[PDB]
Amino acid sequence: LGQIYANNDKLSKRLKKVWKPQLFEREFYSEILDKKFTVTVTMRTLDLIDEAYGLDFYILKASGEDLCSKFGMDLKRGMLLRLARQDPQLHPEDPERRAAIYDKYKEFAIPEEEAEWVGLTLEEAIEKQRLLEEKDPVPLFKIYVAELIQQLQQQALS
Amino acid sequence: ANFVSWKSRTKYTITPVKMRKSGGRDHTGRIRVHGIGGGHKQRYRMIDFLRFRPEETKSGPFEEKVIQVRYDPCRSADIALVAGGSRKRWIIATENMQAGDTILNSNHIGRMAVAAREGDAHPLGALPVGTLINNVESEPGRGAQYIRAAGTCGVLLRKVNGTAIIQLPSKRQMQVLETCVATVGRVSNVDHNKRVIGKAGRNRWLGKRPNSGRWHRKGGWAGRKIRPLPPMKSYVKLP
Amino acid sequence: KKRFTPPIYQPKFK
Amino acid sequence: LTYFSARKGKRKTVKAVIDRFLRLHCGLWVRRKAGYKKKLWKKTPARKKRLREFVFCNKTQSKLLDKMTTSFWKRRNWYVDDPYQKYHDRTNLKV
RNA sequence: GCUAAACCUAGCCCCAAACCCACUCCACCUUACUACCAGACAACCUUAGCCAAACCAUUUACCCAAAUAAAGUAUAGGCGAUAGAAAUUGAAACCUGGCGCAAUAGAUAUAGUACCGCAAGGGAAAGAUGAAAAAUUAUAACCAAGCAUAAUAUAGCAAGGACUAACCCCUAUACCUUCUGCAUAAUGAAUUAACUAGAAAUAACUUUGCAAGGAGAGCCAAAGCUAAGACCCCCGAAACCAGACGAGCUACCUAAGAACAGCUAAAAGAGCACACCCGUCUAUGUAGCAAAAUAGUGGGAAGAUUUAUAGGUAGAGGCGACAAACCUA
RNA sequence: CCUCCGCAUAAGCCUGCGUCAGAUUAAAACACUGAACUGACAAUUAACAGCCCAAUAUCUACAAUCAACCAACAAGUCAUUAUUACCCUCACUGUCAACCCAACACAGGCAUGCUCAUAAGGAAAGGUUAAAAAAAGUAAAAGGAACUCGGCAAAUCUUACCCCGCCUGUUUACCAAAAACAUCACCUCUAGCAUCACCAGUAUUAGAGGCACCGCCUGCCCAGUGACACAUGUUUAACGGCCGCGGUACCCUAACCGUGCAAAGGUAGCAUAAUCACUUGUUCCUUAAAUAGGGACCUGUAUGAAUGGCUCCACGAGGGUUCAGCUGUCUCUUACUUUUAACCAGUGAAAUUGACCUGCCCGUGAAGAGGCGGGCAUAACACAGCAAGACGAGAAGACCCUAUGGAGCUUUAAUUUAUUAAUGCAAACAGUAUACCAAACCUGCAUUAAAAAUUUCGGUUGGGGCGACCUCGGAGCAGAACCCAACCUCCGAGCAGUACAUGCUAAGACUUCACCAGUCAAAGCGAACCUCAAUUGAUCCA
Ligand SMILES: [Mg+2]
Ligand SMILES: [Mg+2]
Ligand SMILES: [Mg+2]
Ligand SMILES: [Mg+2]
Ligand SMILES: [Mg+2]
Ligand SMILES: [Mg+2]
Ligand SMILES: [Mg+2]
Ligand SMILES: [Mg+2]
Ligand SMILES: [Mg+2]
Ligand SMILES: [Mg+2]
Ligand SMILES: [Mg+2]
Ligand SMILES: [Mg+2]
Ligand SMILES: [Mg+2]
Ligand SMILES: [Mg+2]
Ligand SMILES: [Mg+2]
Ligand SMILES: [Mg+2]
Ligand SMILES: [Mg+2]
Ligand SMILES: [Mg+2]
Ligand SMILES: [Mg+2]
Ligand SMILES: [Mg+2]
Ligand SMILES: [Mg+2]
Ligand SMILES: [Mg+2]
Ligand SMILES: [Mg+2]
Ligand SMILES: [Mg+2]
Ligand SMILES: [Mg+2]
Ligand SMILES: [Mg+2]
Ligand SMILES: [Mg+2]
Ligand SMILES: [Mg+2]
Ligand SMILES: [Mg+2]
Ligand SMILES: [Mg+2]
Ligand SMILES: [Mg+2]
Ligand SMILES: [Mg+2]
Ligand SMILES: [Mg+2]
Ligand SMILES: [Mg+2]
Ligand SMILES: [Mg+2]
Ligand SMILES: [Mg+2]
Ligand SMILES: [Mg+2]
Ligand SMILES: [Mg+2]
Ligand SMILES: [Mg+2]
Ligand SMILES: [Mg+2]
Ligand SMILES: [Mg+2]
Ligand SMILES: [Mg+2]
Ligand SMILES: [Mg+2]
Ligand SMILES: [Mg+2]
Ligand SMILES: [Mg+2]
Ligand SMILES: [Mg+2]
Ligand SMILES: [Mg+2]
Ligand SMILES: [Mg+2]
Ligand SMILES: [Mg+2]
């Protein structure tokens, strides 16, 4: 959202011009997730994918300041969780393909306790922390009887 | 602006549905079409423009029977409910159609030309050359849209191999597929251009506000344009 | 034009 | 000339005065006569020579040029190859 | 001596320090101050403009990272009114007040109360005896504008000179200003009490201190450097943008209702004529009953008529049987 | 005595003329005590209207107008079926009033039923006298519009003629209500068509425009603009336009011919008109007296055929005149009643005020003196009426002028297409024997018709526009050093006929009344031995 002069001269009229990128509704194929998605990809993204030799490499190598999208961060987090948890991607009867896929993407391997907090926003992080720290209030009767039995054991064993 | 359309009925019926006037108000509320507003209350009739249509568990041709010819305020021509079988649907009436008439809604195209009357309907592939037709369609199984006013009618011109050129009332040619069903004859309620208004009360009852009182200077489009006939528009899709 | 000024009412405390 | 700025609150100068004049330490401004490079075919060589001379200003003009500048342009510079070095100091002055 | 004059405390502004808070039970997103039932749609957007350059179309600190010298330097700029850095030595933790005020001052505030509009919003004065009001006592009086006590006594911008005594005798054309010239019949004024209008740099002048050096880092210097004193008004317009509000009067539209005696009724967007819709004229008043009234003479009154209820169309626009008419006097 | 009122429903804060004590003070325009009050006492109890409806699929074309004859057009205000489950029952909101919106206890406004005057409800008058003036009511010896621009209140009851608009109606709420806008008839252009108004419509339709019925008719033009074809053309009921001179027998008003231009050189009709000044036109009538009104004429050089021209059936709070009869508008005013007027009792303003012990004439002044000079005038103080003056009161004049202060309208005045539809190029897809085809949807560049984001509209002008000028020199005003203006009267200049030492430095002066600018020149190195009067252009940038 910038401004552009008339005949490329400052001695004319200052008009406002907004450029728009080009959108090509294509279809990709992720090897880590094994599912095709329809994404309105542009040209620079396709060039970066071709230079990174695939889509999974382009997603896992680029940091959060390069995707500029929530779907990219979600895909990155999903791939990290799939590579960390060692969950069966495809299906049994052929583990060699899954082993080769896991060996192809081995230069990262982010731990499980740190891959779950990749790409989440502030509100989503607060919600996840509240859900993990929920815990219904335990009745005080159990604590009372525990303190009572501890006190009676302490006064009896002495 | 809570503007909801009154067209809330997904099932065809016979009872006239009450309609709400607009007066040039869309969904925003601003006047976009001037000259509409303030008129006599009217009731909408669900008019079935598709002529040939099979009933439940039906496929072959079926007979009909005209009952009574009424009048429709939503258009210039009059309507007439025609009963037949186990259902009744409103269709557009034609010229010289009274009570006790019999019409046919066939579809089997024959080898020769069928000398049908001015009430029954048959596809354009079985009608002779030079026959006054009306309510012509554009696509097989779409519905009659062209030539539906009062007294308007079209005449068949020629035939090639799978098309049928129909002469429109505007002296313009237009072809269509051969498997299109069109009625034969002229629409009823003739002599409509002779309806002398007499006073502005009739226009106020019909629901037409008077024109604007501003004096607009005529530009360059107010002159007479002696232009030739535009070319024939084709609706047949060719690969 | 038709020039005209509206009167001003004082508060009801005086 | 903005007597008080909005960030430093100091005094600003006019760059046109610096680009069109030259102040000496004695208190004189060296200027140039206008029209010394345009339409030289209709002028006598005497006028061409007169227009190509470093002419000094007056009193009110010098005061205006001093007021348009700050204390930085009223110092004394010691350049290595200054052609106007002998004109900075003014000797033989009797009121 | 009546009217009426003063009696200090709620506190009010900025510093240093410190980071400041939000359910006793019920009600609060529909007609908030409503206990109880079946489509889950609702944010993610260059701000603009005034002024200045004597107009104005480029431009005009406001951009939220601590000082200063560099430096208002290179630079940008219808190269002009203006804007403006960076590289660089550097930046001593902890202490509770007012050479500010006391109700026309200081926050508008005892208060965001009354009052104005349907609406956003605008929005003002308050309280004075006293140790003992469970001391209803006898005193403390005395000063401005308005009054009686105690009216006028012929002549004159209200004044001066004067004598044994107010007048009588002589002289003498109110106040500030745009103006050569104003009391002029030009502008302002009824008084009293409170408040209100010259804020500041480079360069200059004077007086201490030091001195070829001055100066508490930076700057200047062929008698200079530092410090101090000295100086440059107030109020009053039509215009433009941004964020929100209005069709309850009036323009238009939508859904359901109501109104129109009687006679002639030629079949009628027929006639006279009640109630009703609007107001062509006379007379009354223009600080009136009324910031648009009073009687008839008026046109319509079975329809292009009026009206009770509810909803929608709003300014780079709404609407318009086109009056630049109306959009809460 | 009035009832042009009242009672209910609809909308509206909800306690607002019931009692008690205070009624010393405080609000009644004064009093009693109470519709302009302080505290306590409690009204209204529903049956009145609301608070509403368990679902799945399906059904509902022969109006109302006494609805029975007839007759229509604006085509219309009301209804169920099959199945499943459900036998607990009367809770909630208001029932007062003299009341609402307009700052008010306001001669303003409010929807339906009830007898359209009654069974609802209220008092034009405080008293004293009959001043003048003003307003509202009855009539008058004679004339009945002779007064006034005009029949302007008023009562009799009123005919004909002309213009304009077809008619009803509506428009400037609050100075114009009209000839102004609309209305059926007519004409022009655009559109081959399915879901949000247009339209649940189909070229007898819809949208965008001009006049506005019926009768006579609409004659010409694409040189110029736009629109349509890109075939050089079509369009005018699209923007607009339809001559001049000379010769013409006795007199205006000519037949006819020649000439130059161009689309044609005013067709029909009508009129001195709502029609540029001449125009009070020839002439007849209406009056005894007529720029008032009607009738036959166009030199109308500026009327004119949908910016439509004229009669005609009906009509107009539109604009003018008149006939038979009558109204004090007048000659010439008058008789009575009320509001009001004068005094008594109280609440009690608004505008306005420099102070006044405030007379007249002549003359003077900032040009119209109660305050100045010379005269005339003079015991003091209130009430009751008129306007001659105090350039009296209300609006920083709406008329004229200034403003580098604004705003509205229209462009062929300036920067530009920021948003469409058409285009050409580049990326994006897919077939295709060294060639063509470029579909639906996104991105950037440049162009064309609509919108627009912003702005200004120079100066003197014996008030402003129009008349004239915008720089400089000379002749007299300005006479003998110098300077001096006028919209005082005259010549001119934006250059030239010939060699480039028309090279470079450097003392001293004049200077168009300031500055920016211009001009002369001592001497030296270099070289052989400049004429005319104004005769012109700076900053930035290239
Ligand atoms: Mg029309
Ligand atoms: Mg019109
Ligand atoms: Mg400016
Ligand atoms: Mg720095
Ligand atoms: Mg205060
Ligand atoms: Mg205050
Ligand atoms: Mg006193
Ligand atoms: Mg005297
Ligand atoms: Mg003074
Ligand atoms: Mg003045
Ligand atoms: Mg003067
Ligand atoms: Mg005066
Ligand atoms: Mg004045
Ligand atoms: Mg005054
Ligand atoms: Mg409304
Ligand atoms: Mg209207
Ligand atoms: Mg009628
Ligand atoms: Mg009538
Ligand atoms: Mg107009
Ligand atoms: Mg009641
Ligand atoms: Mg009022
Ligand atoms: Mg009674
Ligand atoms: Mg009375
Ligand atoms: Mg009285
Ligand atoms: Mg008489
Ligand atoms: Mg007369
Ligand atoms: Mg009359
Ligand atoms: Mg009319
Ligand atoms: Mg009016
Ligand atoms: Mg009206
Ligand atoms: Mg009127
Ligand atoms: Mg008209
Ligand atoms: Mg014509
Ligand atoms: Mg004339
Ligand atoms: Mg007369
Ligand atoms: Mg009328
Ligand atoms: Mg009295
Ligand atoms: Mg004098
Ligand atoms: Mg005099
Ligand atoms: Mg006077
Ligand atoms: Mg003035
Ligand atoms: Mg000026
Ligand atoms: Mg201006
Ligand atoms: Mg401006
Ligand atoms: Mg504006
Ligand atoms: Mg001028
Ligand atoms: Mg003049
Ligand atoms: Mg000089
Ligand atoms: Mg020489």
Author numbering:
A (entry chain X): 87 to 244
B (entry chain D): 61 to 299
C (entry chain d): 38 to 51
D (entry chain 3): 94 to 188
Provide the authors' original text about this structure:
EF-G1mt catalyzes tRNAmt translocation on the mitoribosome, whereas EF-G2mt is involved exclusively in mitoribosome recycling. We have determined near-atomic-resolution cryo-EM structures of the human 55S mitoribosome in complex with the human EF-G1mt to investigate the roles of the mito-specific MRPs and C-terminal extension in EF-G1mt in tRNAmt translocation in mammalian mitochondria. To obtain the 55S·EF-G1mt complex a non-hydrolysable analog of GTP, GMPPCP, was used to lock EF-G1mt on the mitoribosomes. All three 55S mitoribosome maps show well-defined densities for EF-G1mt, but reveal significant differences in the relative orientation of the 28S subunit with respect to the 39S subunit.
